[PDB]
Amino acid sequence: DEEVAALVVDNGSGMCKAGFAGDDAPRAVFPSIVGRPRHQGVMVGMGQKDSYVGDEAQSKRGILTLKYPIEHGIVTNWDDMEKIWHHTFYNELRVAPEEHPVLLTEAPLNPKANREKMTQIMFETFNTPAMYVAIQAVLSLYASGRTTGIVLDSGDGVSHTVPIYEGYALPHAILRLDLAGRDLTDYLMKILTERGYSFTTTEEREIVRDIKEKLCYVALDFEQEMATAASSSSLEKSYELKDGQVITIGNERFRCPEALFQPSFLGMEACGIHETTYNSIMKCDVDIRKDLYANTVLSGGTTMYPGIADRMQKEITALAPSTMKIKIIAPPERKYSVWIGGSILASLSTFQQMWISKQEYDESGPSIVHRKCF
């Protein structure tokens, strides 16, 4: 049916995912980074590379000063963001944007002007024939095969709880929590260095991430777990640096992600992801709360810790009404569920009328995004 393959671009704080609508996985996934040379160029006018994007900026981070154009889920540097999209189209996907409708993602509650800037860049710089900006949380719910539920999305720069009913999101019930994977990696660095090791440099942080994504987990009960670690040596695991040396980690394994439930460990006074989810549900209309409790979906890389689903189930229960059915959904590929939701949506029949056409943009201006998107 579809005359053209739509492109799906999920921009995140740490990783951007890109691909073609219709596919079940994104073709390209790389760091949302843009780097420039630390050292001044000796010659002028010889077209040498000035800016490095994604994996190439990573494979050369040593001689570059890196920038993250997306922080806390919000675009903060539009020149570099433009570079990431240019790189996505021409370097990763090898497509000409003017030949494809492009579906992009953004975080809820983001500045109005960013939504318009995105739309302007897509039409005036890349000349796309059509485009749309959708809320990440919503695509994740869709990828789970649901139109009803509350999504807890936790990435590298931010976390949001987004209540969704019969297909649409409830704007006023959406909550934002400035605590994500980035903060967790830094915290893991800290406590491990207190264990005796020494992780302070940027080159080190990189290995502390693998540890985190592979050795960390969410204890069902923090105190019992801490007790077991202080007496029993059964919760320790091994890890080897790039020097072949092996270093064992103990309670740090579950102490790191515990910050997700007790932000005070990071000096933050915000309430954990369980309380934030509850506060969102209670911000909803009592008539639908029951529905949300039974369809709490996990989305994003930081919700990948083993044991997080069962811990969430336990925490939410103690907060919800006794006779309130609680259920946590943890899709296996929730690391790319937002991209997958986009893939699905872009192919939907009732969604086609939603795309913002070049014609609509030409007649209504940037503000068209608010009417057709939000």
Ligand X SMILES: Nc1ncnc2c1ncn2[C@@H]1O[C@H](COP(=O)(O)OP(=O)(O)OP(=O)(O)O)[C@@H](O)[C@H]1O
Ligand Y SMILES: C=C1[C@@H](C)[C@H]2[C@H](Cc3ccccc3)NC(=O)[C@]23[C@H](OC(C)=O)/C=C/[C@@](C)(O)C(=O)[C@@H](C)C/C=C/[C@H]3[C@@H]1O
Q: Which residues in this chain contact Ca ion in the complex, by CB under 5 A? A: 12, 155, 264
How far apart are the C-alpha atoms of 285 and 146, rounded to whole Å?
A: 19
Residue 374 binds ligand Y (CB under 6 A)? yes
How far apart are CB 214 and ligand X at their closest, in Å?
A: 7
* Distance linking the first and last C-alpha atoms of the chain: 28
Could you give the CA distance from residue 362 to residue 268 in angstroms, rounded to a whole number?
46
Q: Within 10 Å of residue 142's Cβ, how many Cβ atoms?
A: 23
Name the residue nearer to ligand Y (CB basis): 6 or 218: 6
Q: Is 284 in the site for ligand Y (CB under 6 A)?
A: no
CB 85: neighbour CB atoms within 10 A? 22
**Which is nearer to ligand X, 334 or 372 (by Cβ)?**
334
Q: Which is nearer to ligand X, 153 or 225 (CB)?
A: 153
Instruction: Using CB under 6 A, pick the residue from 36, 86, 354, 357 that binds ligand Y.
Output: 354
> Beta strands 7-10 and 296-299: pairing type?
unpaired
Give the H or E element holding residue 154.
strand 149-154
Q: Furthest-apart CA pair in the chain: how many Å?
A: 73
Per CB under 6 A, contacts with ligand Y among 113-142 are 134-135, 138
CB of 154 to Ca ion, least distance (A): 9
The continuous run of DSSP H or E covering 105 comes out as strand 102-106
| 283: contact with ligand Y by CB under 6 A | no
Binning the chain into helix, strand and coil, the percentages to the nearest 5 are: 40, 20, 40
Cβ 277 to ligand Y, closest distance in Å? 17
Which of these segments, 77-85, 179-187, 324-332, 348-356, binds ligand Y (CB under 6 A)? 348-356
Binding of residue 311 to ligand X (CB under 6 A) = no
Q: Which helix or strand (DSSP H or E) is residue 287 part of? A: helix 286-293
Decide whether 90 or 168 has the Cβ nearer to ligand Y: 168
- Candidates 12, 69, 97, 163; binder of ligand X (CB under 6 A) is 12
- Interatomic CA distance for residues 277 and 273, integer angstroms: 6
213 contact choice in Ca ion, ligand Y, ligand X, none (CB below 5 to 8 Å, kind-dependent): ligand X
Q: Which residue among 22, 41, 111, 171 contacts ligand Y (CB under 6 A)? A: 171
Shortest distance (Å) from residue 247 CB to ligand X = 19
Q: How far is the CB of 70 from ligand X (least distance, A)?
A: 6
Any long-range contacts for 67-72 (C-beta under 8 Å, 24+ apart)?
A: 67/33, 67/34, 67/35, 67/36, 68/13, 68/14, 68/32, 68/33, 69/32, 69/34, 70/11, 70/12, 70/13, 70/32, 70/157, 71/13, 71/157, 72/13, 72/157, 72/158, 72/178
Q: Which of 103, 118, 158, 169 binds ligand Y (CB under 6 A)?
A: 169
The distance of closest approach from Cβ of residue 14 to ligand X in the complex, given in angstroms and rounded to an integer, is 4
Is residue 180 a contact residue for ligand X (CB under 6 A)? Answer: yes
Contacts of 315 (CB under 8 A, 6+ apart): 261, 272, 274, 275
Candidate residues 270, 304, 319, 324; the one interacting with ligand X per rule CB under 6 A:
304
Residues at the contact surface with ligand Y, assessed by CB under 6 A: 134-135, 138, 167-169, 171, 350-351, 354, 374
Residues at the contact surface with ligand X, assessed by CB under 6 A: 12-15, 73, 155-158, 180-182, 209, 212-213, 300-302, 304-305, 335
